[PDB]
Write a protein that binds this ligand. Structure first.
Ligand SMILES: Brc1cc2nn[nH]c2c(Br)c1Br
Ligand SMILES: [Cl-]
Ligand SMILES: [Cl-]
Ligand code: NA
Length: 333
């Protein structure tokens, strides 16, 4: 028999109850603006693949960010646009300001509200305990919002979190891999960066949901409180599951495989071996012990589960004791 079907524990049917138009991005009609309303100032450093620029809107002299959409399926362009329009105004979600094409090249581009190109990866190995809790809570606001709106991000990693540390402001960026959640849909498992990939992606379980983002968030939290970048340091996608198995143990992995009747790639046969579930105390040392608390470990443990159904939801995570002081200071402020 095939794999056992799965449903999201929360926000399962939100797209079903919407008008077709909300999620049917292939039928979305874009009104393409004129990229000549903008002048590019400078290229932001986003590595070899990406083309993101600081720009000026000539009309109002306001600073924007312009993302040139590298040759790709028009379908993927409409998906990212529709998701950004749907989430516009959500907490800690980047704001889409315009959709334009260069008059000559006809290359499509997205224009965003300005944010400084200071990503979380540049800051997140130097935070106080309180600031890890604070920024984690701000990321959860964005994830509970997009999940509540029927969308999973699928590329949650420090490079996709822009922070203004002076103003204590955070934005979740790069919605290019985001997808609408539909119950029973089988998704592409070739998403997310290696170190942040959930076990569902690594064992090719396609009927995944919002809980994929909660695994990625757990990987970020583990990296920050233990000062270990990345936390799960695989050579490749096969070794990535081995690195997870040496921490979470093989017993819970094989129970997960049996529960969903997953056909494990034969390449895993010799490399997973047999591993105990390790106590988190094993990762604590003199240079990270100020970031590690019972509250932090209890919270992390509830994010990093093989079984996607078992992981905290974004809202359950926001309700964890780890955030009590952040919640109290927010109400007071
Ligand atoms: Br604003 C902003 C929005 C983005 N969407 N994808 N990548 C993005 C980057 Br880099 C920035 Br900065
Ligand atoms: Cl990253
Ligand atoms: Cl142990
Ligand atoms: Na401690």
């Amino acid at each position: 028999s095939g794999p056992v079907p799965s449903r999201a524990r929360v926000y399962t049917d939100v797209n079903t109850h919407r008008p077709r138009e909300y999620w049917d991005y292939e039928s979305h009609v874009v009104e393409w603006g004129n990229q000549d309303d903008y002048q590019l100032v400078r290229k932001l450093g986003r590595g070899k693949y990406s083309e993101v620029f600081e720009a000026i809107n000539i009309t109002n002299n306001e600073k924007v960010v312009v993302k040139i959409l590298k040759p790709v399926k028009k379908k993927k362009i409409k998906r990212e646009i529709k998701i950004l329009e749907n989430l516009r105004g959500g907490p800690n979600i980047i704001t889409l300001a315009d959709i334009v094409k260069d008059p000559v090249s006809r290359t499509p581009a997205l224009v965003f509200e300005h944010v400084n190109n200071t990503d979380f990866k540049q800051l997140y190995q130097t935070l106080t305990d309180y600031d890890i809790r604070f920024y984690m809570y701000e990321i959860l606001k964005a994830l509970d919002y997009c999940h509540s709106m029927g969308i999973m991000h699928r590329d949650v990693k420090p490079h996709n979190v822009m922070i203004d540390h002076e103003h204590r402001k955070l934005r979740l960026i790069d919605w290019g891999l985001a997808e609408f959640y539909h119950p029973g849909q089988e998704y592409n498992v070739r998403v997310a960066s290696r170190y942040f990939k959930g076990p569902e992606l690594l064992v090719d379980y396609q009927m995944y949901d919002y809980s994929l983002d909660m695994w990625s968030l757990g990987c970020m939290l583990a990296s920050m409180i233990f000062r270990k970048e990345p936390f799960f340091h695989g050579h490749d996608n096969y070794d990535q599951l081995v690195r997870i198995a040496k921490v979470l143990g093989t017993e819970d992995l094989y129970d997960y495989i049996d529960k969903y009747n997953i056909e494990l790639d034969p390449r895993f046969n010799d490399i997973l071996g047999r591993h105990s579930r390790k106590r988190w105390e094993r990762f604590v040392h003199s240079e990270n012990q100020h970031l590690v608390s019972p509250e932090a470990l209890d919270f992390l443990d509830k994010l990093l589960r093989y079984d996607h159904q078992s992981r905290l939801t974004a809202r359950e995570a926001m309700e964890h004791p780890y955030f009590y002081t952040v919640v109290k200071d927010q109400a007071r402020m």
